[PDB]
Amino acid sequence: PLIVPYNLPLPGGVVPRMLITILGTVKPNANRIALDFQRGNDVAFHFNPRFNENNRRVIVCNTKLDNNWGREERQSVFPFESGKPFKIQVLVEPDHFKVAVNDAHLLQYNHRVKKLNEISKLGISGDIDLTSASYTMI
Ligand SMILES: OC[C@H]1O[C@H](Sc2cccc(Cl)c2)[C@H](O)[C@@H](n2cc(-c3cc(F)c(F)c(F)c3)nn2)[C@H]1O
Numbered sequence: 140p141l142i143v144p145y146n147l148p149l150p151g152g153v154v155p156r157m158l159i160t161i162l163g164t165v166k167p168n169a170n171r172i173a174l175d176f177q178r179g180n181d182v183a184f185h186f187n188p189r190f191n192e193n194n195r196r197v198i199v200c201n202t203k204l205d206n207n208w209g210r211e212e213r214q215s216v217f218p219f220e221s222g223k224p225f226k227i228q229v230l231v232e233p234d235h236f237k238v239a240v241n242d243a244h245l246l247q248y249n250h251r252v253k254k255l256n257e258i259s260k261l262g263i264s265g266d267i268d269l270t271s272a273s274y275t276m277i
């Protein structure tokens with residue numbers, strides 16, 4: 140397994156048609172997972188499954204600019220399961236990141252950070268065993 144937190148460089152930044160695939164297994168009794176597409180210290184796209192936020196399971200998405208979180212976008216479809224293997228696919232489209240989990244579309248996140256070429260690393264953190272993280276062009 141890859142060591143978490145894991146940094147996946149995205150050479151030259153992201154571009155439409157870039158597909159990121161993450162395979163892992165959620166730990167038993169998991170609390171949180173995060174993907175952070177970063178532009179330097181800024182987080183262009185934070186994707187954050189929370190397994191127990193006031194006894195609800197929710198995915199929180201946001202952007203961090205100059206150390207300030209913005210407006211949260213929340214999704215109650217929650218496809219992660221403690222103890223179970225998952226696949227996350229993040230497809231960069233021209234106007235949003237498009238996320239599917241276990242082959243089912245989950246959400247889209249409109250680009251707030253518009254210098255896509257400067258979003259040149261992906262951090263993967265939280266309560267998973269990380270099997271692989273890679274990218275390809277579709
Ligand atoms: O809005 C999104 C933000 O919400 C609050 S801050 C907040 C509170 C209220 C309103 C607003 Cl707008 C913001 C989180 O504390 C923020 N977070 C989570 C993690 C984190 C770190 C890990 F190492 C990890 F493994 C993991 F899964 C998550 N780091 N930072 C973030 O999720």
Ligand SMILES: [Cl-]
Nearest residue numbers: 171187188189
């Ligand atoms: Cl969290």
